Amino acid sequence: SQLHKVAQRANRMLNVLTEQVQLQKEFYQVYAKAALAKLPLLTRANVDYAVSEMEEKGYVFDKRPAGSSMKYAMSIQNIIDIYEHRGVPKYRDRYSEAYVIFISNLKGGVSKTVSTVSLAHAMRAHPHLLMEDLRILVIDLDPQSSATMFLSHKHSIGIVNATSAQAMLQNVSREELLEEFIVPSVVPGVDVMPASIDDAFIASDWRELCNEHLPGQNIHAVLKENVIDKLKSDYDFILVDSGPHLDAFLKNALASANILFTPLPPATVDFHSSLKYVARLPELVKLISDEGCECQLATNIGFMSKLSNKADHKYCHSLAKEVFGGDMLDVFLPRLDGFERCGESFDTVISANPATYVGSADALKNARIAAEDFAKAVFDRIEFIRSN
Amino acid sequence: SQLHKVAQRANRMLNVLTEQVQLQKDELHANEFYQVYAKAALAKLPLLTRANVDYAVSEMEEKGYVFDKRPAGSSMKYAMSIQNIIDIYEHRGVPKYRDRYSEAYVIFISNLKGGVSKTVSTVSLAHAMRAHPHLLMEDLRILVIDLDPQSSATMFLSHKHSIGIVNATSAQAMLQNVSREELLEEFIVPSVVPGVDVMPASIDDAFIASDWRELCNEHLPGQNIHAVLKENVIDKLKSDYDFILVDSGPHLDAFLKNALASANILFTPLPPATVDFHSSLKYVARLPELVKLISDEGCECQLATNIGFMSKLSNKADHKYCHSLAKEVFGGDMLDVFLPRLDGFERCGESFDTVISANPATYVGSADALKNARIAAEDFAKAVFDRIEFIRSN
Ligand SMILES: Nc1ncnc2c1ncn2[C@@H]1O[C@H](COP(=O)(O)OP(=O)(O)O)[C@@H](O)[C@H]1O
Numbered sequence: 001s002q003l004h005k006v007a008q009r010a011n012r013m014l015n016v017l018t019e020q021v022q023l024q025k026e027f028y029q030v031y032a033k034a035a036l037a038k039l040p041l042l043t044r045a046n047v048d049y050a051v052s053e054m055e056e057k058g059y060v061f062d063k064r065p066a067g068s069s070m071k072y073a074m075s076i077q078n079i080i081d082i083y084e085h086r087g088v089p090k091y092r093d094r095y096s097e098a099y100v101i102f103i104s105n106l107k108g109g110v111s112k113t114v115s116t117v118s119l120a121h122a123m124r125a126h127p128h129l130l131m132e133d134l135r136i137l138v139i140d141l142d143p144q145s146s147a148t149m150f151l152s153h154k155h156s157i158g159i160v161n162a163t164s165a166q167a168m169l170q171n172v173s174r175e176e177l178l179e180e181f182i183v184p185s186v187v188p189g190v191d192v193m194p195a196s197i198d199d200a201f202i203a204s205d206w207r208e209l210c211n212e213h214l215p216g217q218n219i220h221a222v223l224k225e226n227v228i229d230k231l232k233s234d235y236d237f238i239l240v241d242s243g244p245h246l247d248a249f250l251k252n253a254l255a256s257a258n259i260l261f262t263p264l265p266p267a268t269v270d271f272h273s274s275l276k277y278v279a280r281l282p283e284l285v286k287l288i289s290d291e292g293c294e295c296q297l298a299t300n301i302g303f304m305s306k307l308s309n310k311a312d313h314k315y316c317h318s319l320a321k322e323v324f325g326g327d328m329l330d331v332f333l334p335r336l337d338g339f340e341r342c343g344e345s346f347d348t349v350i351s352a353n354p355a356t357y358v359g360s361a362d363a364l365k366n367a368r369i370a371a372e373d374f375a376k377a378v379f380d381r382i383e384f385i386r387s388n
Numbered sequence: 389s390q391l392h393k394v395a396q397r398a399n400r401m402l403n404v405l406t407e408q409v410q411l412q413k414d415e416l417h418a419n420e421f422y423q424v425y426a427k428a429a430l431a432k433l434p435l436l437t438r439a440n441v442d443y444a445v446s447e448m449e450e451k452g453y454v455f456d457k458r459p460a461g462s463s464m465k466y467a468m469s470i471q472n473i474i475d476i477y478e479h480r481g482v483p484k485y486r487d488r489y490s491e492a493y494v495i496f497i498s499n500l501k502g503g504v505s506k507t508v509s510t511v512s513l514a515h516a517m518r519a520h521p522h523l524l525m526e527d528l529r530i531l532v533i534d535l536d537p538q539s540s541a542t543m544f545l546s547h548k549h550s551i552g553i554v555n556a557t558s559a560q561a562m563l564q565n566v567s568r569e570e571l572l573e574e575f576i577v578p579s580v581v582p583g584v585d586v587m588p589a590s591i592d593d594a595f596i597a598s599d600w601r602e603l604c605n606e607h608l609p610g611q612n613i614h615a616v617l618k619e620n621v622i623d624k625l626k627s628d629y630d631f632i633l634v635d636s637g638p639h640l641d642a643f644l645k646n647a648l649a650s651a652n653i654l655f656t657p658l659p660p661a662t663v664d665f666h667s668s669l670k671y672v673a674r675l676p677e678l679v680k681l682i683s684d685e686g687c688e689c690q691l692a693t694n695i696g697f698m699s700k701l702s703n704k705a706d707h708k709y710c711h712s713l714a715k716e717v718f719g720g721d722m723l724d725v726f727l728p729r730l731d732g733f734e735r736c737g738e739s740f741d742t743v744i745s746a747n748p749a750t751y752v753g754s755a756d757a758l759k760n761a762r763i764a765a766e767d768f769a770k771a772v773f774d775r776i777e778f779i780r781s782n
């Protein structure tokens with residue numbers, strides 16, 4: 001009974017530490033008016049007419065003095081509103097229901113979380129996708145909660161309780177999900193439904209917890225029916241992140257996705273493992289199907305992750321190209337220091353402010369551009385699939 | 389069905405890759421471990437003197453013992469392997485650990501919070517304990533059972549061109565329920581440091597964990613689902629090892645439960661990061677509940693205590709706060725030593741080497757980094773060993 005003893009001491013500690021984070025409780029990117037001209041469909045002249053015409057109508061743009069005078073400090077919203085003023089339709093004007101993206105791989109360390117949060121921020125803030133005025137939701141279903149930490153400033157969530165796995169069991173309305181479970185991330189337009197280590201116990205007793213709280217409901221269609229379907233009209237993209245564990249969460253995530261992206265690692269051994277997952281994927285969809293709901297899983301796109309020039313890497317890259325063939329993204333996430341440094345302070349290569357960044361400013365830009373290139377390639381891929 | 393297409397091509401590629409690594413399967417030769425001592429260096433070890441070593445060495449050669457000398461100098465030099473030193477201690481009559489205890493002792497370093505250093509501690513503990521200068525006379529035999537589909541332990545313990553893929557895994561051994569002779573011949577693999585072995589894991593074990601109930605029903609009818617590891621694997625190796633370490637992933641599944649039911653003692657690595665620490669505490673506060681669950685539904689846990697230790701601790705002030713909190717929680721069950729965050733552990737982890745198996749000459753970094761990592765690892769291992777000794781004899 002020495003555990004009971006220590007376990008209690010740790011309990012008083014939690015209740016104490018929990019009242020810490022509670023008692024505790026921004027996007028740097030701004031564009032100079034002239035900078036908008038490099039954005040698609042916009043020119044120096046038409047931005048001047050838009051800003052001019054909108055102002056005369058009562059619009060007020062963000063500004064900040066650079067010495068004495070006061071220039072324009074355009075926020076993403078200002079830009080989005082300028083495009084709207086110029087009759088450029090938004091993504092929601094051609095697609096009516098949210099598309100669910102699931103970056104998955106049973107093998108860990110392959111960059112599932114980083115590629116997921118990077119894709120969320122980079123798609124929203126992509127210079128070429130701002131006109132799309134995208135609304136993105138990242139649903140964290142990994143008790144390790146890496147996505148949560150990356151997306152909402154660690155001093156925010158700290159000890160989370162309103163969890164995605166909780167949402168699944170509580171089965172609440174759209175309004176409650178937006179108001180009580182979903183929290184904003186640093187980049188406006190990108191939200192997150194958090195996770196917490198406590199979700200490990202939920203996954204562990206999923207079977208029973210379902211019989212108690214969701215009687216008669218197919219245990220594999222919960223995330224899809226109790227959460228995603230209720231939010232389909234408030235978001236353009238919904239990204240689900242789960243751990244590399246063949247859980248109820250992994251299954252619920254698979255049953256709700258429209259598309260899968262498999263991040264492929266460069267080392268031969270990890271690449272080998274990943275192919276095992278890609279090979280048994282149809283087996284997994286078959287199971288979930290044979291016992292409940294059907295997976296609307298269209299395709300499975302692969303892409304190299306943390307790739308480099310090592311001979312071994314080039315080799316795997318050739319093999320992956322062989323396996324996925326056409327469904328192989330033409331862009332990949334290379335291994336960069338920017339992603340590591342950022343990963344250490346749980347910040348996105350998009351939200352990380354260069355003025356605060358500890359490391360070379362060059363390295364940061366490189367990863368940002370890499371995240372952006374990756375996001376644009378993903379978005380374009382969905383586009384082709386969705387309008388064909 | 390443009391998902392079954394890739395699966396097909398993927399499956400084919402596996403065959404190719406498999407047969408490829410199936411050739412480069414180098415044979416891990418024992419006399420390849422870098423560590424060697426000049427005859428004179430043994431004198432610095434406990435119980436050994438320059439004179440009792442020369443006497444021992446002389447008598448052994450008289451009985452035909454063959455020292456693997458090197459052709460250097462007018463008369464060959466003794467390039468002593470940790471095994472030579474072990475054989476010398478044996479010849480002087482100092483008792484080995486297996487002379488001091490009669491059954492393997494099962495250690496389980498665990499935490500539901502991942503990234504806390506469960507694998508690196510487990511792996512460093514094994515190697516550092518075997519090769520620790522003050523523990524050579526113990527002639528330890530250590531087995532690391534990898535039950536994490538990620539197989540990080542398997543990777544640190546062998547060579548990338550030594551184990552490659554993994555077919556006969558621990559999860560597989562649990563369900564097949566084979567003989568001790570079979571576990572020894574087919575399922576256990578040696579690591580880079582002789583004396584420490586590993587029962588491997590593979591990604592395919594994630595499917596086994598996923599369908600544990602159905603698989604136990606079809607392969608192990610009547611057997612309690614939480615006692616499979618204890619009865620089908622560990623109990624059959626009780627005489628073959630002094631220590632058996634179990635490594636599992638951060639999941640509250642069958643593997644985690646079986647490891648617990650087989651453990652003699654538990655070690656909990658506690659991270660300094662306020663968020664990580666808080667998560668670790670939630671795990672410590674639910675341990676009794678978990679043990680109670682296993683009990684209520686079948687077998688009992690012989691879990692003695694739960695020792696806690698700071699993992700990846702820095703000189704930062706923040707860290708010193710958690711350390712205190714941790715002390716309040718664990719109190720006496722806190723380890724006197726902690727695992728500090730060091731470059732040696734990082735650079736080594738990058739190449740899946742242990743700060744014990746990593747040859748300093750080859751280390752691409754600062755010798756001091758590697759040297760400090762090894763020492764820290766050795767002090768941690770001696771501390772765990774000394775603590776087990778006090779618990780075991782008392
Ligand atoms: N492209 C990259 N370059 C450098 N480091 C990366 C990259 N992608 C991921 N990482 C780092 O690799 C580790 C694994 O990524 P993570 O997203 O947590 O994987 P999974 O989601 O596979 O667990 C993290 O510590 C992260 O900072």
Ligand SMILES: Nc1ncnc2c1ncn2[C@@H]1O[C@H](COP(=O)(O)OP(=O)(O)O)[C@@H](O)[C@H]1O
Nearest residue numbers: 502503504505506507508728729730733734737
């Ligand atoms: N003392 C340490 N100093 C520096 N890096 C460490 C230390 N202990 C562990 N690590 C590194 O931290 C990461 C997490 O450790 P790992 O043993 O894999 O954790 P778990 O077993 O938590 O997955 C690894 O990348 C590892 O190389």
Ligand SMILES: [Mg+2]
Nearest residue numbers: 112113242243
């Ligand atoms: Mg993840």
Ligand SMILES: [Mg+2]
Nearest residue numbers: 506507636637
């Ligand atoms: Mg581990």
